[PDB]
Amino acid sequence: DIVMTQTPLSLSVTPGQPASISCRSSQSIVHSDGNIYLEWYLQKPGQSPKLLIYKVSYRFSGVPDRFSGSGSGTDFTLKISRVEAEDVGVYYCFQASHVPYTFGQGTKLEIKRTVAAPSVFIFPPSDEQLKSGTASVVCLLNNFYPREAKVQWKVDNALQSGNSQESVTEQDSKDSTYSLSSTLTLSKADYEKHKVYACEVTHQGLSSPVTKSFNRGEC
Amino acid sequence: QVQLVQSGAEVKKPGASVKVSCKASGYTFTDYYMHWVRQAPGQGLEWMGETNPRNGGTTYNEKFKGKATMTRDTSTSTAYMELSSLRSEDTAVYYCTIGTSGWDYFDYWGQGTLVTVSSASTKGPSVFPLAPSSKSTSGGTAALGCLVKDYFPEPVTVSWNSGALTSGVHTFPAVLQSSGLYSLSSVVTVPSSSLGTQTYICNVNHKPSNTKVDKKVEPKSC
Ligand SMILES: Cn1c(CNc2ccc(C(=N)N)cc2)nc2cc(C(=O)N(CCC(=O)O)c3ccccn3)ccc21
């Protein structure tokens, strides 16, 4: 089977700057009809792959002018003249010259935008969840850049360990930022042992850490 | 108006079978071959095979022979892929795709079907409001959401106001809890000025448990 090898594994580009991804086929890829069926696809998290380029150098209808494809033999290249926020995602090359048709392993393009501090929000548990015997407290860090952020839970000023989980979004296709949720989960008994619930956020965009807090039950 | 609409997420026990469907519309079904593509974490994107819709003729990627069986129903414009003797390793997103320009490219793709293979019990989610309050404001902006907790397996999909609200929505990737159940939140930022006139409802769908939950997120008086 033809092995498609992509290089680099990851790329981080400032908007307005060029991008270049390589594709190497383990053997030649000339179809029985004499054409080279080499395609490039872009896939965004949770979405289907979208067609960019076909037959090595042909750009698909509706695809921006900035994308171009080139190559011959066993070495192929996708080029973006000026990177834009909408270009984030994973780029895959694909050969359909020889059965079984095969894909490259993907190259992740990340957009190197300006620093953006997070907006911080805190949510006490709902009355419905409290009734069930559990308390989840959600801290939200919205639309920030870069990805690196430190969230610390403080309960009655005591630093917490082992009772929280965090999840980070993919980089946004419009503004190139990330969002992060950090959820502190306690039994109703443990939640009732303390009063002040706080999430302290550290990020490059902030001059000093930002604390968002509340007093349990007191509304 | 070309569309490929796949069947919903499925959860099956090891050894069982599953038949995934792909409803095609907006074109003459017999005009183009139907292809199936698997996307598994690690193995990546793999082309599984192609089906000739005119005669049901199939060409498989050798790796999937026996495992996958491709069929079609021209009368209903539906393509099917049946996976047999399911194992943990068969857990993946399966896409159907067509090419409308001979064999030049795959221009149309289905939304994908997640098939999870597990002996664990299917569990529907608990949906809790993340109410806007004085604690979830940022200079004219209010954040609100829904916490979708204790479900199995993936995926849950979240929409707001039946798909009418999409701007500023962040539906986080699921986390795996120590219990082996999943949890996620879906948040949205809106103007704090209109919390008294606008209605925000999250629509949580969990196809493996056949569950659909609509939760109205009410502003909190704190
Ligand atoms: C093997 N194969 C494929 C695979 N598709 C494919 C798409 C995209 C890609 C890719 N991604 N590069 C790679 C492969 N498409 C084919 C179309 C024909 C064909 O000529 N016709 C028209 C016949 C008439 O009307 O004269 C046809 C149409 C429907 C049923 C039967 N025959 C023959 C053979 C074909």
Tokens of B202: 């999250």
Residue B177 sits in a domain whose CATH number is 2.60.40.10
Selection from B80, B71, B148 nearest residue B113 by Cα: B80
Q: Do A97 and A3 fall into the same domain? A: yes
Q: Do A51 and A147 fall into the same domain? A: no
CA atoms of B207 and B7, how far apart (whole Å): 10
In this complex, the residue of A55, A121, A125 whose CB is nearest that of residue B143 is A121
Position A121: which residue type? F
Q: Do A108 and A8 fall into the same domain? A: yes
> Which residues span the domain enclosing A166?
113-216
CA atoms of A89 and A91, how far apart (whole Å): 7
**Cα A182 to the center of its chain, rounded Å:** 17
For a mutational test of ligand 1's pocket, the pick from B33, B48, B77, i.e. the residue with the most ligand atoms closer than 8 A to its C-beta, is B33
Please give the backbone phi and psi of residue B185, each rounded to the nearest 5 degrees, phi first. Answer: -125, 155
Tokens of B76: 């209903």
Q: Do B110 and B124 fall into the same domain? A: no
CA atoms of B2 and B107, how far apart (whole Å): 10
Q: Do B95 and B139 fall into the same domain? A: no
Instruction: Identify the experimental approach.
Output: X-ray
Closest residue in B to A100 (Cα) is: B61
- Asked which of A97, A112, A127 is the last residue of a domain, the reply is A112
Domains in chain B, number: 2
CA distances from residue B159 to A30, A61, A202, A215, B162 in whole angstroms, order as listed: 45, 30, 31, 31, 6
- Asked which of A85, A112, A139 is the last residue of a domain, the reply is A112
Please give the backbone phi and psi of residue B128, each rounded to the nearest 5 degrees, phi first. Answer: -115, 145
Q: Is residue B86 within 8 Å of residue B18, measured between CB atoms?
A: yes
CA atoms of A182 and A169, how far apart (whole Å): 12
Collapsed DSSP state (helix, strand, coil) of residue B174: coil
- Asked which of A86, A112, A138 is the last residue of a domain, the reply is A112
* Documented resolution in Å: 1.8
Contacts of A102 in chain B (CB under 8 A): 46-47
CB–CB contact B112 A179 (8 Å): no
Q: Do A83 and A124 fall into the same domain? A: no
Domains in chain A, number: 2
Q: Do A119 and A64 fall into the same domain? A: no
Nearest CA to ligand 1 atom 35: B103
Q: Do A103 and A24 fall into the same domain? A: yes
What does DSSP assign to residue B193?
Answer: G
CB–CB contact A219 B221 (8 Å): yes
